[PDB]
Amino acid sequence: QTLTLSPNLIGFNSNEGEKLLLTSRSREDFFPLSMQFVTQVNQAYSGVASIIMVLNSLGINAPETAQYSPYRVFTQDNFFSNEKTKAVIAPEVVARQGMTLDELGRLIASYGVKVKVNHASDTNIEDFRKQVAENLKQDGNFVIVNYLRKEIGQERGGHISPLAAYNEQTDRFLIMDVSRYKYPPVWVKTTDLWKAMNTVDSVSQKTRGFVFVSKTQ
Amino acid sequence: QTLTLSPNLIGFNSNEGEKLLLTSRSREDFFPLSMQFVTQVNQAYSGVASIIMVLNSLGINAPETAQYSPYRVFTQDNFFSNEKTKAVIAPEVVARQGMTLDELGRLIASYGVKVKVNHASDTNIEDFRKQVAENLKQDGNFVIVNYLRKEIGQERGGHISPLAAYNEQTDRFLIMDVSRYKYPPVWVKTTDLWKAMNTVDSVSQKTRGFVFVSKTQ
Numbered sequence: 104q105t106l107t108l109s110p111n112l113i114g115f116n117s118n119e120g121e122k123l124l125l126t127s128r129s130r131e132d133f134f135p136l137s138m139q140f141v142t143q144v145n146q147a148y149s150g151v152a153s154i155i156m157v158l159n160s161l162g163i164n165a166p167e168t169a170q171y172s173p174y175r176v177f178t179q180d181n182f183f184s185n186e187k188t189k190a191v192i193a194p195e196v197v198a199r200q201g202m203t204l205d206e207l208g209r210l211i212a213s214y215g216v217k218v219k220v221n222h223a224s225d226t227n228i229e230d231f232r233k234q235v236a237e238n239l240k241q242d243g244n245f246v247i248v249n250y251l252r253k254e255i256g257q258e259r260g261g262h263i264s265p266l267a268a269y270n271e272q273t274d275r276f277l278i279m280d281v282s283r284y285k286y287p288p289v290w291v292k293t294t295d296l297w298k299a300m301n302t303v304d305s306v307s308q309k310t311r312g313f314v315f316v317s318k319t320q
Numbered sequence: 321q322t323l324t325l326s327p328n329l330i331g332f333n334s335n336e337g338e339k340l341l342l343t344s345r346s347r348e349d350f351f352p353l354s355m356q357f358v359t360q361v362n363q364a365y366s367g368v369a370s371i372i373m374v375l376n377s378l379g380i381n382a383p384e385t386a387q388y389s390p391y392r393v394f395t396q397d398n399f400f401s402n403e404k405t406k407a408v409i410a411p412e413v414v415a416r417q418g419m420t421l422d423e424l425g426r427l428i429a430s431y432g433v434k435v436k437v438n439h440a441s442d443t444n445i446e447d448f449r450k451q452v453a454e455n456l457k458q459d460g461n462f463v464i465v466n467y468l469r470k471e472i473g474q475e476r477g478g479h480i481s482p483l484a485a486y487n488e489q490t491d492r493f494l495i496m497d498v499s500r501y502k503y504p505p506v507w508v509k510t511t512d513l514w515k516a517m518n519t520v521d522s523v524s525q526k527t528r529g530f531v532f533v534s535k536t537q
């Protein structure tokens with residue numbers, strides 16, 4: 104039960120979508136993110152799924168729980184075991200209204216990793232293409248985006264999901280969509296994704312945007 | 321945050337493992353499996369995680385539950401919502417002792433899908449390489465392997481995980497290891513994987529092996 108993609112998007116679930124990855128020259132992040140790819144456990148945890156993909160990909164030290172002990176890994180359930188994390192915003196609130204861009208950043212920063220929040224309002228499409236594309240060539244850092252689905256031709260509201268690769272020939276980014284029951288990963292034209300982050304989240308009264316994540320040293 | 325690999329195995333989490341994928345001509349399965357890649361929810365559910373990766377990739381009509389409704393998708397928690405699945409072996413039993421190859425086959429078949437169970441004792445490495453390598457070239461069917469982790473230099477017992485791709489130059493198979501907190505995906509020599517399948521499961525007193533899955537056309 105997958106939803107159908109608007110003509111403007113190229114699904115990863117297609118030959119075209121696979122070739123956009125095999126031809127892309129900015130994709131170093133796809134392999135680790137794919138290894139950690141996860142379904143948001145409820146329809147408002149897209150930010151939590153996205154964070155744990157990134158933190159697990161960065162290999163930073165993970166929570167110690169009964170679940171997988173002795174093994175340690177970020178999961179959507181144990182992400183909030185960090186008291187500074189709940190302090191930002193409680194899990195039962197995220198389970199209702201999700202998380203804003205600034206909150207996403209603080210929730211990542213609660214685990215001591217380096218974050219840079221970019222509101223669409225404080226930048227422009229060129230430095231986003233330039234900077235994001237650069238990140239996608241490098242290990243040890245990642246990109247998460249927060250965007251209004253409606254503006255790239257999907258249903259519907261604000262979403263969060265990491266990016267895995269950029270296709271230089273088509274000017275499209277690959278979104279590793281954590282709503283896996285709903286949409287496959289899609290290749291979205293920078294034009295559409297920009298429009299999509301350049302939207303005001305009523306919750307924050309601030310624009311959506313994108314966040315760079317890396318380790319502090 | 322995983323265990324270190326034995327030298328005989330090339331992790332997907334390396335340059336070597338990444339290009340073993342890019343230079344394989346038997347990999348059509350990797351893309352849809354990668355999109356469904358999950359962590360087994362407890363340390364005995366590797367069979368259940370493997371099945372749902374395959375059923376979700378096959379676009380088998382999925383359970384209808386509250387969790388993701390209106391969207392329909394296989395999860396480890398809703399796989400046993402089908403009464404004939406539970407009849408094969410109860411979730412509470414799988415959660416303790418996992419599943420044998422034979423039970424793996426019957427659990428898949430309980431969803432009306434076409435399954436061919438191959439115990440190692442009734443075939444041989446050469447027809448395993450040939451038939452799996454060709455399944456990895458075709459859409460609409462998938463391969464799950466059951467194997468003793470020791471025989472490939474991993475810790476430790478019988479495991480289950482789907483196969484994504486076969487790299488002809490090296491004669492290695494990519495295991496999409498659902499124990500994601502413990503090991504990354506690994507490229508394992510065909511000979512090594514045969515050794516591991518050709519072992520007797522004390523639970524079944526039968527050899528381990530591999531399973532082909534497809535839609536009932």
Ligand SMILES: N[C@@H](CCC(=O)N[C@@H](CS)C(=O)NCC(=O)O)C(=O)O
Nearest residue numbers: 146147148149200201202261262282
């Ligand atoms: N207020 C943020 C919320 C971002 C967010 O967390 N969205 C959640 C729902 S509140 C999600 O998981 N959505 C899945 C989807 O859009 O399909 C926004 O509008 O951008």
Ligand SMILES: N[C@@H](CCC(=O)N[C@@H](CS)C(=O)NCC(=O)O)C(=O)O
Nearest residue numbers: 363364365366417418419478479499
């Ligand atoms: N009895 C089967 C069990 C296969 C199985 O279900 N393994 C479970 C444990 S009982 C598992 O999830 N193992 C994870 C791992 O070995 O990494 C065998 O030995 O092959």
Ligand SMILES: [Ca+2]
Nearest residue numbers: 131242334335
């Ligand atoms: Ca790398």
Ligand SMILES: [Ca+2]
Nearest residue numbers: 238241244245
């Ligand atoms: Ca990067």
Ligand SMILES: [Ca+2]
Nearest residue numbers: 117118348459
């Ligand atoms: Ca295909």
Ligand SMILES: [Ca+2]
Nearest residue numbers: 455458461462
């Ligand atoms: Ca196949």
